Amino acid sequence: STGSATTTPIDSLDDAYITPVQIGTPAQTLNLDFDTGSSDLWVFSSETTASEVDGQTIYTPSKSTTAKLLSGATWSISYGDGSSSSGDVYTDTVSVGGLTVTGQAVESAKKVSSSFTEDSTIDGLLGLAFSTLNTVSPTQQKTFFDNAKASLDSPVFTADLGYHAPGTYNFGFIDTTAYTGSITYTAVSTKQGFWEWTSTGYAVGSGTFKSTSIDGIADTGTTLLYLPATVVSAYWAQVSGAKSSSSVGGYVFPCSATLPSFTFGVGSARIVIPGDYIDFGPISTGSSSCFGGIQSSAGIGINIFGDVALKAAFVVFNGATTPTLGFASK
């Protein structure tokens, strides 16, 4: 089997991408944030505290003929931005782009933190990291990809995110029309439960390539590119007036600037992020200070190849027995 679904930016900044997901019978379609950096499929629901729901579409398990309470199971998760959610668990039929998993754990939120309430466009998350990170207790649950894997034509999914434009998540096949050149595959460590790999270095704009190992994770659920402070400083030093602002929480730059590209290494190959992809616009409406798309990972504890990096590439998440990541230009 295969599936293919379009993913769409939630706003003009590409802050996140949402993908329609069918849950239950008859189908209830919710727009979920596919997150290769976590492993819970959770949704706003008829159980979510009413004061914490503000415009989201909710899953109502009592209206699904295939929903079953996963008795005694609870979940609770926090994200890298400090946001969180928690609740109980149903199993139900879940379909993404024509690919169906029966008995998928659908984690129903009883509580969500303010950032989720405030984002009316995100109805929940669909985790695509390794199932060892799933937070359901006392019986840990598998991700949608893990459940589908044995049925897929090939044990892979691909992320083809757009820049200020829709893109595609495919399951079970590699669309050879979606990229240019070849896909370069690189080894993955699952030791932390992430799609963790080692970039071979970087370049700023037209500069020469710096060969240096950069461990990090491929995370579709993170907006920006978080790299070591040395690398990030070398980038922003090329932008007149750019500076790290503790009050804003990262590097800002004059909105009058044209940004250089940023290249990262994948083995002997290179992915070039255009400068425009690094512009996240005014820090507040009308400001002439703009927020940078490349930020320091210092104090996060891990480098994150988030959407800024991933949307410059066609990315293969190969979940074979020995997992790998593939990157191609597009």
Ligand SMILES: OCc1nc([C@]2(O)CN[C@@H](c3nc(-c4ccc(C(F)(F)F)cc4)no3)C2)cs1
């Ligand atoms: O500790 C550093 C690390 N962090 C992670 C992640 O937690 C897993 N991927 C990312 C992710 N964030 C979100 C997300 C957070 C908040 C919202 C809100 F604003 F709507 F609330 C929406 C989406 N989704 O995925 C970060 C992995 S490593």
